[model samples]
Target: SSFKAADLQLEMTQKPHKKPGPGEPLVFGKTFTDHMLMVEWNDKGWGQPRIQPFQNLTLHPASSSLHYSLQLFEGMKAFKGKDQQVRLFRPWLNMDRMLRSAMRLCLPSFDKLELLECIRRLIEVDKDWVPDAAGTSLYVRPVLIGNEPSLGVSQPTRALLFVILCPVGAYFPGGSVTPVSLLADPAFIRAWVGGVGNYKLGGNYGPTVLVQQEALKRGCEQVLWLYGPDHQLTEVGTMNIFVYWTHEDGVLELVTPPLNGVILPGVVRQSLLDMAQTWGEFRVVERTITMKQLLRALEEGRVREVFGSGTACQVCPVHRILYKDRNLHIPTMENGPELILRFQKELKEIQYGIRAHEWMFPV
Candidate 1:
């Protein structure tokens, strides 16, 4: 394993991977591109780059990521702009988040800017892989793992960073009209205070699969995770939740759960807040919202719209929530002169590079 900094050439794999069909939508992390970027690291620094054929990654029997869950990942998207150019929506934001997650997992730190440069190179090399479909785009996943073949729970001195891309079609293949159902169970927490709930580490996802499956079995598309002692709504599915409603003061407002050390700092969530501030549409408040408050609003005829935001959903509709042994069905408008549409329009514009914003980075 004697490698030097001078031999840092990117080893290209001879076999190119599969190509996407004409109408294939990006399924987040479901599929991968022709190649993946891999770089090994140690106590010294980072090593050579290996742009190899996308395939199964080999690991040892006792790799820390598998047994002790020393792993982390990031979710980002690349869009096809109006000028037929490819762009990434706030990609550096994801990198920054990933670095924070890595630090939390007791992993080593490499050059974050260097990783961004490498990602741009990967996008430029696979520019055609970016999808043109309205909902379809390239999903970029940068995963880090502890590959030290060990049996103990100690932190590994070695790690690997890998980037995989996929050309996915629309998130809502049915044109974004359909609404998804949610299940709210306060006992089953997604994250907790003084915990790693706010981080995008791999451990955060594994513990939610069972409840998610239970939600699916109950005919719900996702689970709305509640936080705090009072069961305040923290997040929905893997996406951040947003509520559009008229408050008791008779003034319209938009609400998103505050960071408060409980919520994931999503890029789209921040974008929404910025948009609301810029447009002065309504009061965009980041604070704790409880199920009782939402129910009261629903009964008072003040709740206007409810949706979740993420890279996958953008702004997914929520028609019903199963909570406290009661089913509350929400009447959300799919299309109209509404707040959701305005948010979607502005978001898409920024994503497509129609409007110049700091959120987009052209490759």
Candidate 2:
């Protein structure tokens, strides 16, 4: 039976935690905070939001999330500004995307604004958990999962949405810039035209584990997912891929596969587009460009820069692409024009509320 929606109980974990070291660089998603925020939901509605100490959760062996992969998650961050204010970057966007994903998984819709308020309170309650180190951030892992212990692929009346905060270190650990290698294999496809790839569903990721390992073993950083006959680039692992180069028409432009039902609309991807266009500096075009086209650009020495955009790194520069039995190296470092740096600087500024754009919600 569902617990009374207004009187749900929470069990907190009893454990002490330490603050992050100063000037310390941590890998993304490496360290977690002392406490976590949680809540359960059923057909009735969402239960009470709780800021409990962090711990493991016990569940049935046949829970829908475990058996049928009915879990979905969102990645976000909370930054401790130089002024010591804890701020969230476009949190509503994350929450909005999360709710849509939840709906897709047969979860009842609850109040998102109220949940946002609860998140802000949770951050306030765990103020010391926010790291002060430069290039470090409080990573937020928001998850929604079906809780009903059923084996059938039916709509689950019960679900959950919880947030776990982790103090993450630099995405590019060494600080020294380098391009990443991409594995292009047509034998494996990441997502299809009419599949659930457009949604942030948990089931979609479980299948990519082996493909990811294949790329790693092949001496590549991540796999560049291509689709259809032309092998149009879809995405790069968990991040959106961007190619900056001179098009066949000899015009400077940036390209990423269009959101043609096969792309995950990432917040960071949108942010990069916004920042790039606001300056009207160059052509920011979102369209399907093939691996053949990219290779040709590299061959012609007209490719300026290439990188991946995601919640984890915001911008990961690509130094080389290992594909087709040969490695294509990109001289991104030689050029002072680093799009990832621009994205990093602009995004960090927005996240910390330094520039104070409308996207920064005070939660």
Off by over 4 Å in 1: 1-8, 24-28, 334-337
Index of the highest-TM-score prediction: 1
Least accurate 10 contiguous residues by lDDT in model 2: 1-10
What is the Å distance of residue 201 in model 2 from its true position?
Answer: 1.9
Give the range where candidate 1 is weakest over 10 consecutive residues by summed lDDT. Answer: 1-10
The local lDDT score (0 to 100) that residue 308 gets in candidate 1 is 90
Best by lDDT: 1
lDDT of each: 0.82, 0.79
Clash numbers, per candidate: 4, 4
Off by over 4 Å in 2: 1-14, 20-27, 174-176
